[PDB]
Design a binder for this molecule. Structure first.
Ligand SMILES: [Mg+2]
Ligand SMILES: [Mg+2]
Ligand SMILES: [Mg+2]
Ligand SMILES: [Mg+2]
Ligand SMILES: [Mg+2]
Ligand SMILES: [Mg+2]
Ligand SMILES: [Mg+2]
Ligand SMILES: [Mg+2]
Ligand SMILES: [Mg+2]
Ligand SMILES: [Mg+2]
Ligand SMILES: [Mg+2]
Ligand SMILES: [Mg+2]
Ligand SMILES: [Mg+2]
Ligand SMILES: [Mg+2]
Ligand SMILES: [Mg+2]
Ligand SMILES: [Mg+2]
Ligand SMILES: [Mg+2]
Ligand SMILES: [Mg+2]
Ligand SMILES: [Mg+2]
Ligand SMILES: [Mg+2]
Ligand SMILES: [Mg+2]
Ligand SMILES: [Mg+2]
Ligand SMILES: [Mg+2]
Ligand SMILES: [Mg+2]
Ligand SMILES: [Mg+2]
Ligand SMILES: [Mg+2]
Ligand SMILES: [Mg+2]
Ligand SMILES: [Mg+2]
Ligand SMILES: [Mg+2]
Ligand SMILES: [Mg+2]
Ligand SMILES: [Mg+2]
Ligand SMILES: [Mg+2]
Ligand SMILES: [Mg+2]
Ligand SMILES: [Mg+2]
Ligand SMILES: [Mg+2]
Ligand SMILES: [Mg+2]
Ligand SMILES: [Mg+2]
Ligand SMILES: [Mg+2]
Ligand SMILES: [Mg+2]
Lengths: 90, 273, 42
RNA sequence: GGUAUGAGUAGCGAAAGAAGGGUGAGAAUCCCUUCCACCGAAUAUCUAAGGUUUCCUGAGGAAGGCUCGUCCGCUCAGGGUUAGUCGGGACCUAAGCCGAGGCCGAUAGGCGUAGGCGAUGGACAACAGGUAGAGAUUCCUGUACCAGUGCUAAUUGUUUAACCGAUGGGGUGACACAGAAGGAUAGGGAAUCGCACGAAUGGAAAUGUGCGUCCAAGCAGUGAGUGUGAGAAGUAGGCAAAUCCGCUUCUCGCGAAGCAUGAGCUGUGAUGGGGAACGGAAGUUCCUGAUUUCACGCUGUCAAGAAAAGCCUCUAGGAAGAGUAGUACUGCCCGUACCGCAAACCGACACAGGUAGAUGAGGAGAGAAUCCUAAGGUGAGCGAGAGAACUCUCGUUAAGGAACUCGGCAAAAUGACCCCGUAACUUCGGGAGAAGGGGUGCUCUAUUAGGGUGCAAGCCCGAGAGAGCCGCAGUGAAUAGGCCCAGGCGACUGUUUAGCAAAAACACAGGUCUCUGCAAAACCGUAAGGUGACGUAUAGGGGCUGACGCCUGCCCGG
């Protein structure tokens, strides 16, 4: 399925700053290839994808009173839609 | 010939070396090279089982032909080459059929000469015949012990063996050691002394040059502690405080014969040395 | 120069899980550490 | 476990700070400014390891920080790492490891063949700008390349063989070390040109001062050079085959062509980009010149210097689709933050220690030495006074000069370059920088004399002599051997008791004895299997001795 591959959009000062450059930032499945992401985004948003850049974020160490542990590892995809494609909303 | 170095340094003072005059090329036959890794005297257990080996110069193995299988095909000596794996020089033989092999370079084997192997072969130097076909008094080398196995018995630089006689299906050979034994008559040997006979005269000249040849230093037994060697211990220098000098492993090591007493080959040894 | 000169690979090759599993005595170690209830084997 | 005592004591961990301004409840300690000082073959810039969020922003000041703290590598929130081309994997093998069957073995297991895995090596396509709180050969702009894929179009095959082509053959791949001379370019200098200024305190509109003084991969040309005798017959070999390799013969033979390679250069790339001044000028010439590159190319040496894939070619095979051109698409996974000679790594510490590699500017210089500096980095997480004893680290010292002391221990002295001069002894190499003497600055006659580059202009190196000049002193600072005579021991360079012994000890080349005929002896292992050795008596193991010279006597009774 495609909506298992795309988890949720990423809304930060950085991710919002490139919504005008037709570059949309998503949190995707940690097993998903950037090819799987390119076809997932095309199936969900009816856009034409130019390129998909992807980066693995390792979990960040957090303490909450004696109890220490790691946040979840993330896979972040930045999908650049072509100049003729429709835009994703956010 | 031997070249005596001038004593410019204390390291070169008494050092001697081959002039390598016999050597005709410096570029070995690429097709006949195999890789060769140093073992530094270590076993398949990785344990050091022979002392004093390790860390020489890197070497390639040249696949030598000790068998001499190519009967009745003329072989032209192409070059006399240096071989780092053995005291003797080697000779690249261009066979008329276009096959190239290395043989041990016999004393007086020059480029241009045409060597022959088999039953029709003449008694000229680098020729290889079965011992049944070699006259008495002849000087041979690269003697095989089992038919078809390839020469193993006199291959080192300057070594020679002499055919003494024929007893049944065996031949009396007098080996380089002066031993006389019975080699099987279907075993082939090559004609003539092995060549590079100046080799024994060489003076290594400095510690370092032994290290280049892959030899680590030998520590005498008598400067070890009692727990390391039977000659260990004693306040100051000590004599051998034993009835006999001992190997590191016990066992007498002066005049104590180590040939196995009930040995299968004994029936073939005619005179010892 | 101190005794511990770290190496990610040497650590795992000497003391790692797969190396422990590759021998009967290494499996004894894993069994022992499980029995004691260690959070970390290997 | 708690809490004393010692005690407000030792210590606060190498180092230069100052003032002004700001912030704030509060400031030696945070921020800014200016001056000052320190590193600069590093105390700078990269990169690998290792660490693993320490990175950025905002907030905080309990604890941590040897003081303080508004600050922080600390606490709390949010964020931040973008790749067909960079590094790794979807490629390759080395050591080594594993290992179907197999061999061996009370059990457990040990070994090992095919076959795998395994970089520290091999192969392999991207550059310059821009941008910025935190990434950038990754994002954006421009311009490429590699591998594919379709889609159009001709072109040529469509069963006698276009085309592909081995899991097989062959070639290449493919390698040490040292040395010397070159080409080139990085880099470094002058001038030139551009822009700005024209001056504090006596002088200078000028040989005046300051700042600048150009750019990719790719593509197309060229090109110092470096290698290399082409061609045709034949065919006991390359497990089959081969038009390929190898071998042989014959013709042509040459030093030149061709053919390989080849740093660099020119053009384009660029109407683009950058650039001294709210924005835009100049880009030239010369000298010098590599530790880079051509290139282990050449020459030489002996100690004789990976493999495999890849690439090329050969046939065995397979074959109707193949290539060429255009066009538009496709290109996965892992890493990417930050520190990285360090406060983030190894040292329990924000620890005078340790930590591989790339780059590493100028003056004087042989230099990466030295001193002072450039770019860049830093002022080191306690301070203010005081200027006692004593201790440590330093400077100087009358007269004397080893009287000190176990002992000149320590310190002093010597030190660079140039010229003269140089003993015994000797294995004829040495000893030797022996020892011992003398010199060294500046100015002028000096576009030097003469050299190097050079079509020339010019620009760089410039001696000796003479004349002068100044100081107590001219390698004016820093950095650069103390020397000699006679013995013992060990020939020598090496090695050693990590952390009280560096030696006369070990080793060593050489010597001699002895074992060992190859399934060698010897060694490891219960064995198999190994090392010895892919060696074979001129070799291998063991014992003793220890270069070299002269020698090595008598004794076989134990
Ligand atoms: Mg990535
Ligand atoms: Mg030995
Ligand atoms: Mg001792
Ligand atoms: Mg004993
Ligand atoms: Mg005594
Ligand atoms: Mg004794
Ligand atoms: Mg530790
Ligand atoms: Mg007190
Ligand atoms: Mg006190
Ligand atoms: Mg104090
Ligand atoms: Mg301090
Ligand atoms: Mg220095
Ligand atoms: Mg920070
Ligand atoms: Mg505090
Ligand atoms: Mg703060
Ligand atoms: Mg790109
Ligand atoms: Mg192997
Ligand atoms: Mg293998
Ligand atoms: Mg691999
Ligand atoms: Mg950064
Ligand atoms: Mg080779
Ligand atoms: Mg980075
Ligand atoms: Mg430190
Ligand atoms: Mg070091
Ligand atoms: Mg500066
Ligand atoms: Mg005095
Ligand atoms: Mg005086
Ligand atoms: Mg006295
Ligand atoms: Mg005296
Ligand atoms: Mg006295
Ligand atoms: Mg005395
Ligand atoms: Mg002294
Ligand atoms: Mg001086
Ligand atoms: Mg000595
Ligand atoms: Mg010690
Ligand atoms: Mg000592
Ligand atoms: Mg064996
Ligand atoms: Mg001795
Ligand atoms: Mg010896």
């Amino acid at each position: 399925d495609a909506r298992d591959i795309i988890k949720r959009p990423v809304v930060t000062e950085e991710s919002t700053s490139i919504l005008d450059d037709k570059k949309y930032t998503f949190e995707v499945d940690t097993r998903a290839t950037k090819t799987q992401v390119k076809y997932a985004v095309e199936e969900i948003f009816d856009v034409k994808v130019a390129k998909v850049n992807v980066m693995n974020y390792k979990g960040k160490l957090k303490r909450m009173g004696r109890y220490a542990g790691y946040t979840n590892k993330r896979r972040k995809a930045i999908v650049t839609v072509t100049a003729d494609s429709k835009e994703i909303q956010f | 010939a031997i070249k005596k170095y001038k004593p410019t340094t204390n390291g070169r003072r008494h050092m001697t070396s081959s002039d390598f005059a016999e050597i005709t090329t410096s570029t070995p036959e690429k097709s006949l090279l195999r890789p060769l890794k140093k073992k530094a005297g270590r076993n398949n257990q990785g344990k050091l089982t022979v002392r004093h080996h390790g860390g020489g110069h890197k070497r390639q193995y040249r696949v030598i032909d000790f068998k001499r299988n190519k009967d009745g095909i003329p072989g032209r000596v192409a070059t006399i080459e240096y071989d780092p794996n053995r005291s003797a020089n080697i000779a690249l033989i261009n066979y008329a059929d276009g096959e190239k092999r290395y043989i041990i370079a016999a004393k007086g084997l020059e480029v241009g000469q045409t060597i022959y192997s088999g039953a029709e072969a003449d008694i000229k130097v680098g020729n290889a015949l079965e011992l049944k076909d070699i006259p008495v008094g002849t000087v041979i080398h690269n003697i095989e012990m089992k038919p078809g196995k390839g020469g193993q018995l006199v291959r080192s630089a300057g070594t020679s063996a002499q055919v003494l006689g024929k007893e049944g299906k065996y031949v009396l050979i007098r080996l380089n050691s002066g031993e006389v034994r019975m080699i099987l008559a279907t075993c082939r040997a090559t004609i003539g002394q092995v060549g590079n006979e100046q080799h024994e005269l060489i003076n290594i000249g400095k510690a370092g040059r032994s290290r280049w040849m892959g030899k680590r230093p030998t520590v005498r037994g008598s400067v070890m502690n009692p727990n390391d060697h039977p000659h260990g211990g004693g306040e100051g220098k000590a004599p051998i405080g034993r009835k006999s000098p001992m190997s590191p492993w016990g066992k007498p090591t002066l005049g104590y014969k180590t040939r196995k007493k009930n040995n299968n080959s004994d029936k073939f040894i005619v005179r010892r040395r | 120069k101190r005794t511990y000169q770290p190496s990610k690979r040497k650590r795992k090759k000497v003391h790692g899980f797969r190396t422990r599993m590759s021998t009967k005595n290494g499996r004894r170690v894993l069994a022992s550490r499980r029995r004691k209830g260690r959070k970390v084997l290997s």
